[PDB]
Amino acid sequence: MSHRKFSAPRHGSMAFYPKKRSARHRGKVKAFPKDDASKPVHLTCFIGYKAGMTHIVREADRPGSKINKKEVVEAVTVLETPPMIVVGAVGYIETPFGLRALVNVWAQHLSEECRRRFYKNWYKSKKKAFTKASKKWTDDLGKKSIENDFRKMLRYCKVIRVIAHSQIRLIKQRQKKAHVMEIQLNGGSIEDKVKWAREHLEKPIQVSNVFGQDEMIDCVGVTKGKGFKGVTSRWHTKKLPRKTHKGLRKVACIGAWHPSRVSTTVARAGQKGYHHRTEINKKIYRIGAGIHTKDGKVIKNNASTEYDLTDKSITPMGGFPHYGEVNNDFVMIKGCCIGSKKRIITLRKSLLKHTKRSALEQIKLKFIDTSSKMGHGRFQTPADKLAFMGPLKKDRLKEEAAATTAAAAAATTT
RNA sequence: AACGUACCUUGAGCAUAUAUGCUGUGACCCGAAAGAUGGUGAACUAUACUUGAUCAGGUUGAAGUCAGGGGAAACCCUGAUGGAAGACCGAAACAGUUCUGACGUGCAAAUCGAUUGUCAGAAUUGAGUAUAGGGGCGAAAGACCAAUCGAACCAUCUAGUAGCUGGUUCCUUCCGAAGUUUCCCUCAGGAUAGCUGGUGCAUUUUAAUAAAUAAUCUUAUCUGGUAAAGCGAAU
RNA sequence: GUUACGUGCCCAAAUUAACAACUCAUGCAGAUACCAUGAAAGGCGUUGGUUGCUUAAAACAGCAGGACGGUGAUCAUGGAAGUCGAAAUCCGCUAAGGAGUGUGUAACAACUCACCUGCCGAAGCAACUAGCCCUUAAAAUGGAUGGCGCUUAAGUUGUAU
RNA sequence: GGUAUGCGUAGAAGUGUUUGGCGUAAGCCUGCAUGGAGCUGCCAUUGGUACAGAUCUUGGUGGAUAGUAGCAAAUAAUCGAAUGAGAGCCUUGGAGGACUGAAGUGGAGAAGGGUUUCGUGUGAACAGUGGUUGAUCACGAGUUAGUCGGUCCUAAGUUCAA
RNA sequence: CUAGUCGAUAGAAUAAUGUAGGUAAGGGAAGUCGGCAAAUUAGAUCCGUAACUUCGGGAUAAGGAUUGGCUCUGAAGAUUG
RNA sequence: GUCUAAUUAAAACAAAGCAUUGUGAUGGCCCUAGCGGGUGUUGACACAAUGUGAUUUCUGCCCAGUGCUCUGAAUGUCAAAGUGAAGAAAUUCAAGUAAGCGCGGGUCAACGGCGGGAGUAACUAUGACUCUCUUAAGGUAGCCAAAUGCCUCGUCAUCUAAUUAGUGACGCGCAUGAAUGGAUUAACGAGAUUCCUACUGUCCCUAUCUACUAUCUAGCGAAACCACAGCCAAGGGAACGG
RNA sequence: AUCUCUCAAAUAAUAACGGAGGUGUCCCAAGGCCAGCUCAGUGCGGACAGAAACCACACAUAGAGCAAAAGGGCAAAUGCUGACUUGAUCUCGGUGUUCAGUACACACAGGGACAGCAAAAGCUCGGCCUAUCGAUCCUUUUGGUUUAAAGAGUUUUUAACAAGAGGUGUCAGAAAAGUUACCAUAGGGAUAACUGGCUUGUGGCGGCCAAGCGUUCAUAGCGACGUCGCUUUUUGAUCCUUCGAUGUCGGCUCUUCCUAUCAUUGUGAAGCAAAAUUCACCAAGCGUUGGAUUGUUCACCCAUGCAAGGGAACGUGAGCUGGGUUUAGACCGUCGUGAGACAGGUUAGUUUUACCCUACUAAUGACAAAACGUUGUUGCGACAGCAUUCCUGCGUAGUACGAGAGGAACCCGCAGGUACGGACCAAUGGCACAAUACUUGUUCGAGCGAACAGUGGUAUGACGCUACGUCCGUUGGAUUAUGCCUGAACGCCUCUAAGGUCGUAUCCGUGCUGGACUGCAAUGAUAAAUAAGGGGCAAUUUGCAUUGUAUGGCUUCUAAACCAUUUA
RNA sequence: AGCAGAGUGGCGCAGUGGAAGCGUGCUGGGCCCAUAACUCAGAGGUCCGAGGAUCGAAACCUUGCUCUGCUACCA
């Protein structure tokens, strides 16, 4: 009569949770797969934006399952991302109190749309950074500054990370400012990274050398937030019965009598969502590269794989809702990328040692549903729309007056 | 000459001032449920009376009457016409049920909002008039009698009593207890001795510039059945 | 100026120009009377003992030889013949071989013990008694020698100054 | 009541005090600053005599808040013009949206109110917000009868000639 | 419509919980003290009506069908015959 | 139809009906400090006082205890005045001696009552029976684990996937019962007690949307309450601290 | 009130609703006192003669009697018997134990008298001593032959003094029946129901020795007869705190901790073949349910489960609920004559305030402080939290194994699934752009609307938001339980005596979420104006002025060593 | 826990210190054509157990055993 009498779950796993609105809007990488050699000598992570979910058809190559050699429709998430710019390289050393940051010099030519993370009122600004520090590539520079410090990366340093832009200007968004992110090189024999990084300043980096077909990846970013929701939903605690003046929808018993306190674990009224989140080992499906300028028009293999062969793009008709003009190159990953609309989402490499079968299975995909989401799928492409539907008293049928006036245009000159 | 005496055995009281108590009225202080003598109000409400007044539209067909039809008579038989009953569902009139929902420092010293019952009579009601504080009145609950009802309401005899609780106001110096026996319709209190404090007063070669005492051991002398024993004594 | 509790340190005073031994703890080893704990019963855990034996005619441990017949006389036939269990009952043999020690051996047997001697040659062994540790000994908020802590002690004991 | 040829508008009582001091202590003495008319010391007496308290009486005043609680029922107000020191109102008048629905938030009667009805004029409390108008004040007027009605008659009943 | 009112502190603002008005795919009392808040039913015509009855009921039993708008015919009267 | 107005609307109340009870006027019931009033503008088919409760259907036995009246045959009590005797007298007794209570009946639709013991049937079990005990007379006709049976979560079918319940029937019934009223009851309930039919966010389990609040801002602006007061553990304590 | 025996620790005194009891009487002899004469028993006896009578004789230290309870005394008595008599008398005052050294009462020694027995001396002022009992007011006798009646007689009455008696057993003395669930008050923890608290007969709870059982076999598992021990869930105990109020029983929601462990991980035991199951050590990490009646904890079902364990601040009413219970209505059965109780049954009933301060979820943040600025961006982790879970099938195979029957769902791999956990929305489910189409009622004269019915009702309905859908949820390092490793003091062995190792959902760490609220790291910018200033470079070149430190020139120092795994 | 108590012939009861009391059964005969009824006759008692006191106890006393009554709390 005084001990629970039906033991049960609790709700809301107290590990994650002092559950506050995060200390960072960026994607804090939190860690990297440690220091491995004969491994991805190149980068550890990448900078991605979120722009919707687009419905992939495929099948797997399982052992004797119940869908084995039988085709399915599993959801995908587009974490679109343009290439980035590397402009500096930070070295590190080791204390018994932590991993102290020692040396980085930035490259001499920052991007103007990445010269904004340092200011805050840029319309008011006189645009005076980097004035002083960038002219350190104009002096003697090596006997005093750079090869001194590069030797300090050579002699002293062990863990080198490099810094990275996010070329936001190639996605038309209402944000219009960069996102500086650290990225760690992960080879061995540190001077090979110094030879790597000193040639990788002021150069672009696209996802091709960073990622490929059928890799695992981790979606470290912010979540969509909510705001101050309640007590009944904010950890999924049940309804008290109907009769409750003082609440159909609150949590009853907060402590016992003794001791004379209130713990932090009790179901409390506390801010919902907008935490930091990451779940790990999300599986890549498709990488593509579809802007322009290869021979002529390029947009192909995005709306298609080799069983539909119809080009248009991974764009919907009228684009992803609240997000959607995928101009750039992009990746295609799995069920629920985290974070709301238009986000900033970081993606570091995986950490487990996969003996699970359902990580390594290489398969193509079969069909990308290129429909809207602002409606429902009744067609596929607006190019295909004139196959079913014929004349339409609109631009389909208004253009016959634009034809007789074009016929009157030759009658105008003659 | 035996014994009782508040008795004289050469006198000591009064007159007041002071201080401490004990006692009698306001009896250190305020305090209670109630008892009394007088007047008081039916202006909600119990309630009869008088005289006024109002309470929509709707379904169910009571006697009585009405020919058609059967049959020997008694007459049985559908059809209507007829609008009666403390009859029904419902509205302003009223009531107040379940939600135990809305405020519970209200809209309020009892109301609002959903819901539910009667609704042509034991009905509903404006005015006039009766009924009175240990009684009026009560289709009966000790309901109601002016926000009070197992006795109101307002001034007194009323600073009514309390073994029962609260507070019982300036400083230092000196001294420093009780919680026990008895008695008592006492067992939460009082008297009673006990302890304490005060007031001096008589005096020691134990009081004034011992050969006399009162308290602890000795010395000596009586005093008890508890340990320890004791069952090869009683019981 | 100096004392009836106590000095590693918060704590004022010794980690004493005072030591002899004590006690190893794997989930509270213990720590200053009342006082805020621990019993019944063990220990090839240790350290002190009392009483028994036995050994230099060399013991223990340790590896060598024998181990039955008179007699299957006999008790026991689910076997008794040495042997589930035996009334009995000696001896012969011999340094040492017993109507017998034997694996829930039903017969004969097989068979090693006891025993004596080889072998090694200074201590060994039986119960007994009682210091600490040791098992005992299980509570709900997480925290108690009073905390920090200690271990040829700051510890449980007798004590010097 | 006796007393000190007692100080007192050339500042007497209390009130403050970072002036100074006496007692073991209660308490005084003292300097300055208010203040404006009366006061204390010795010794005899003495009364309704000193307060932290009484769920103490009365009168200010806190924190919470002096800006939190909450002013959430009755469909719901709106631009433009005034005027005004200043207008979401009310204060109007111009539009024009919706309510009250004739068992009304409409027009006039009873009991009770008692000058509220009306014009004129307005500053502050009054109208749990404002305020130029108000059921507040200021200041003026305002209710006409033979027929409307009290008046007569009597009803239950006041017990009301001796 | 007729009469009269905007009089209930205001411009703003999409948090909980509460305050009242709701719908929610499956099953449908398991829920909880309990079928209580809440849902279906609701008007009228046409049938169709069970046991028990004091033969007045129970009776709206239950159990059902039917029900717009628009275009028409059929019927129920009065005066002068 | 009525009531607890402000927590009890119902199983309390209220009937209609039915059997009683006093009274023929000098009256019965009754207010009355006293004089005169109410019942009563009246008169047993009227008044007064009751217990019940439509009706349908039957009113079980008992007058001991007290309540009660009596056309009540009454030496056993019994008061003053008044009458007798003694006594100088206050006083002492005598003869007396009415109503009451006791005494004699009548009565329960007046309160309230309405037992156990052994034995006993060609199995057992029983008890149709037989004996005895004792009372004012022994619970009768019907009901029932009833709204009322401690033992209780009774014993038995059924409703149920599985039911301390609700129905049925069974009677040793702690303490069932005939107007302190018994047993059936048709019509209605803001009545309780359970299983179907319909059913729906009651729930499995929350999903969301509109109405004004908070909230935030401009005016407005208080109240209870408060030793000063706020970081917990273990130990002490007046024994669950700040 | 009152009496004894102890309780009482050797004077006395004395406790509780401690133990054993007793008393409200009884006796003209059971009194007073002289006289004779000794019983309890038991032996041998004796017509009828035993347990039977009555006589006789011995032993008779009291083993009896003494009115009564129990103690004490008691031997030519204090008993048996006998004689004879009223001292169970009048009187005066003191003294004993009750204690205040009171009163009553009861005993005791006198002085005086009058006697009574005995020859005398003596003995006697009631029972052999510890009980065998009462104060005023009056009523009332007995009384001197007594005074008073207030002017004086006489006579009767009352009145008084003195001894008793009628009487007060709640025993120092009122005359005395009930209940209030309509109840109103002074108060009390001096005194309970509830919550805590020490205690544990009660019960859950283990230990030990083995009488036996277990076919044999005491000890696999068991363990009787008896032996001794912890917990606080109840069950009483007790009265320590709150009576000027601690809102007291259940379920719901909900954090938590707890081992005496149900089942899951790692073993070991067996009468452990296997399957199955039992024992026992370590182990709190997730798990321990959906329902019928009841108001429940338990109880008992039905079912899932390859499987359903106990417990904590009476957890919790400013979170509810109010079904019981513990007010006011109301019926019933008995018990009381009744108003009226019923740890028995029915039904009906207001369940209140938070804005205070910490506590806690989320919200922003300052002067200052500091190996220093105003302000960036990008970093590090001390630090605190810590969550994934267990089943299932198919292989493994009818294989091993087992005589077979049965059966390793063995190790692992594969597929899946449960619960929570973290999230998103493409599709599908929900809710509605109250946008739009059909639409009733009324006004807008008629034709558009959605004009208004506080959202008219209806159907579809995109953004979102959401669950019923979706995608996900992991790896390092020690080391208990344990097996072994080598090895002696203990010549042998031997898992320890020190030593190297195999190992768990446990615990620690990565892994994931907040971060000395404002700790920390490098790193960017560094001003108005460029007339004039501002700000650095400055630790400085340049004086005045101040602090600090070696204070008598030095109570300075110096920042360069003692392995480079590890040892009395 | 006081207390109302009771326990007697096979069974039922009556019995207040001098007795073993009544009735029904049970037992025998007569009566009967045979069984019942009828008639005569006989038989039937640690008086619940252990004690108390005494001239004697079923009764008087308390004490235990059996058994109702009868309401009360809560090692």
Add this chain to the structure above:
RNA sequence: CGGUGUGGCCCU
């Protein structure tokens, strides 16, 4: 004019 019940089952 007083009372008076009962007779195990089957035998040309």
